[PDB]
Amino acid sequence: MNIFEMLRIDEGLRLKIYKDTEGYYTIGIGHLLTKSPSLNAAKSELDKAIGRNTNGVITKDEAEKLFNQDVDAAVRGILRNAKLKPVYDSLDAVRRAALINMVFQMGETGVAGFTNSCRMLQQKRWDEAAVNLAKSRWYNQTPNRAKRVITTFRTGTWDAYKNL
Ligand SMILES: *SCC1=CC(C)(C)N(O)C1(C)C
Ligand SMILES: [Cl-]
Ligand code: NA
């Protein structure tokens, strides 16, 4: 298991524009196109992201290219962020993947706001961090995914993803 396989499980793969859990236009492996309610605004963002007139459909290779870009942007984003970099540097490799997963889903600003959870992760208080992370809109809105990410921070193993 690695971050790519973990996110593929959590996000799925869809080659036509769809709406995510929040109702936003998305494509591929969790690639948000726009928060706008217009399908035409979403098709324009998609064509710009891919570099051709797609008419709302992409290939598997194009979805994987967007995914590679998005993972790389999440990692570079964490490492440029003064609040997240210290947390990332403190963690083992499995727990680093759980932090990337959260940034990929929420964005850097959303994760930097989990102030108390950050501090507990930096202190290696795994069970206390797990409890604090679950007291969130994130957990209440996507509990199965959140439970897998929380388990990963609690244990430092891939157990929540093995058998999927
Ligand atoms: S959650 C962002 C964050 C990380 C850490 C370095 C522990 N910081 O004290 C805050 C809480 C800003
Ligand atoms: Cl879920
Ligand atoms: Na998704």
From Swiss-Prot:
Keywords (alphabetical) are: Antimicrobial, Bacteriolytic enzyme, Cytolysis, Glycosidase, Host cell lysis by virus, Host cytoplasm, Hydrolase, Viral release from host cell
Q: Some GO term, biological process aspect, for this entry: which one?
A: peptidoglycan catabolic process
Per its UniProt record, what InterPro entries does this chain match?
A: Endolysin_T4_type, Glyco_hydro_24, Lysozyme-like_dom_sf, Lysozyme_dom_sf, Phage_lysozyme-like, T4-type_lysozyme
A GO term for molecular function: lysozyme activity
**Which family does this protein fall into?**
Belongs to the glycosyl hydrolase 24 family.
What job does this protein perform? Endolysin with lysozyme activity that degrades host peptidoglycans and participates with the holin and spanin proteins in the sequential events which lead to the programmed host cell lysis releasing the mature viral particles. Once the holin has permeabilized the host cell membrane, the endolysin can reach the periplasm and break down the peptidoglycan layer.
This chain belongs to the protein called: Endolysin
Q: Which organism is it from?
A: Enterobacteria phage T4
